[PDB]
Design a binder for this molecule. Structure first.
Ligand SMILES: Cc1ccc(O)c(C)c1-n1c(N)c(C(=O)N2CCn3nccc3C2)c2nc(C)c(C)nc21
Length: 291
C-alpha cells in the first residue's frame, strides 16, 4: 500500500517467499527442527563451497537434505534495513517467478526469509559466462558465441514477450549449462514496463541516460556482452570509448577477426537508436541464428 510509512516500521521462523500462491508459508525438511536454534538454511543443507560474494551477500553450492540434489543458494548479507529494503529484495523472487520455467532462464526452486535474511535456492548452474571467458583466457570461438547468443536471445524473447526488461544483461549474469548452452540469471533489477535502479554502466543502452526504459535496452546490453566474449575486449565504464560503442563504433584492434555474419548481427544489436535496434524475436528469426 505505502512503503516508507508502515505501522511498526521497526523473524526467527522461516517463511516461504512466493508471489505465485500456495498458501503454505511454513518450511519443513529432513534435518530441520525449528526448536533447535540453527536457521532453516543451516539445518536443511550441506554447504559445499562459496560460489560468489559481494555487498549483496553470498552464494553457496549446497546439497539439499530434502532430495540429496545439488543447488545454489544466494543469501542476503544483513537483516533487512526496513520495509522498503525488504520489499526491494523480495521483488527478486516475484520477478524470478514472473519469468517462469524457461530452459534459457536460471530456475528458482524455492525462496524463504528468516531473521531478516532472504534466501533464493536455484538450480546449480555452470560458471558465469564471464568466469568461462576468464578460464578460456582468450576470445571465445564463434561456434561457442553463436550458441550463447541464441540462448540469451531465447531468454530475452521470453522476458520481452511479457513486457519484462532484465536491465543487467552481462557475462556475469549469464550461466553455463551442459553441452555449450547458457541461461540468463540475476532478475534482481528486472522491471515490468508500465508498473512501479541501474544495470552495469559498461553494458547500459545509450537511451537509458535519458531514462528511456524498453526491451531494446536488453538487446544493446547483450550486443556488448557478445562483443566482449567474442573479442576478449574489456568494456569502458565511461569516457570517449563508452560513447563510441554507443555511436556504432566497432574497434578494429578487437573486432577485425569477427565473421561478417557475427559482425552484421552485432551491428543490429548495437544500433544506438532503440526504435531501429533489432528485437530478440527478429534476431532469432534470422537463418544464421536457427537450430
Ligand atoms: C543462486 C542464484 C539465485 C538467483 C539467480 O538469479 C542466480 C543466477 C543464482 N545463481 C546461481 N544459480 C549460481 C550458480 O549456480 N553458479 C554460478 C557460479 N558458479 N561457479 C561454479 C559453478 C557455479 C554455479 C550463482 N552464482 C553467483 C555467484 C550468483 C551471484 N548467483 C548465482
Amino acid at each position: 500500500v505505502d512503503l516508507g510509512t508502515e505501522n511498526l516500521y521497526f523473524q526467527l521462523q522461516p517463511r516461504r517467499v512466493s508471489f505465485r500462491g500456495e498458501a503454505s508459508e511454513t518450511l519443513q525438511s529432513p534435518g530441520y527442527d525449528p526448536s533447535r536454534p540453527e536457521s532453516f538454511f543451516q539445518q536443511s543443507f550441506q554447504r559445499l563451497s562459496r560460489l560468489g560474494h559481494g555487498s549483496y551477500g553470498e552464494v553457496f553450492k549446497v546439497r539439499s537434505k530434502e532430495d540429496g540434489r545439488l543447488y545454489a543458494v544466494k543469501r542476503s548479507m544483513s537483516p533487512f534495513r526496513g520495509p522498503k529494503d525488504r520489499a526491494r529484495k523480495l521483488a527478486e523472487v516475484g520477478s524470478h517467478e514472473k519469468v517462469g520455467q524457461h530452459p534459457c532462464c536460471v530456475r528458482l526452486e524455492q525462496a524463504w526469509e528468516e531473521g531478516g535474511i532472504l534466501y533464493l535456492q536455484t538450480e546449480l548452474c555452470g560458471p558465469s559466462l564471464q568466469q568461462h571467458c576468464e578460464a578460456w583466457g582468450a576470445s571465445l570461438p564463434e561456434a561457442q558465441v553463436w550458441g550463447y547468443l541464441r540462448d540469451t536471445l531465447l531468454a530475452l524473447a521470453h522476458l520481452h514477450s511479457q513486457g519484462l526488461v532484465h536491465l543487467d544483461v552481462k557475462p556475469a549474469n549469464i550461466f553455463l549449462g551442459p553441452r555449450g548452452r547458457c541461461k540468463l540469471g540475476d532478475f534482481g533489477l528486472l522491471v515490468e514496463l508500465g508498473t512501479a535502479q541501474e544495470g552495469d554502466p559498461r553494458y547500459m543502452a545509450p537511451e537509458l541516460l535519458q531514462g528511456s526504459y524498453g526491451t531494446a535496452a536488453d538487446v544493446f546490453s547483450l550486443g556488448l556482452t557478445i562483443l566482449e566474449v567474442a573479442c576478449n575486449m574489456e568494456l569502458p565504464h565511461g569516457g570517449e570509448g563508452w560513447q563510441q560503442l554507443r555511436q556504432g563504433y566497432l574497434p578494429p584492434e578487437f573486432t577485425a577477426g569477427l565473421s561478417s555474419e557475427l559482425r552484421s548481427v552485432l551491428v543490429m544489436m548495437l544500433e544506438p537508436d532503440p526504435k531501429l535496434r533489432a528485437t530478440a524475436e527478429a534476431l532469432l528469426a534470422l537463418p544464421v541464428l536457427r537450430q
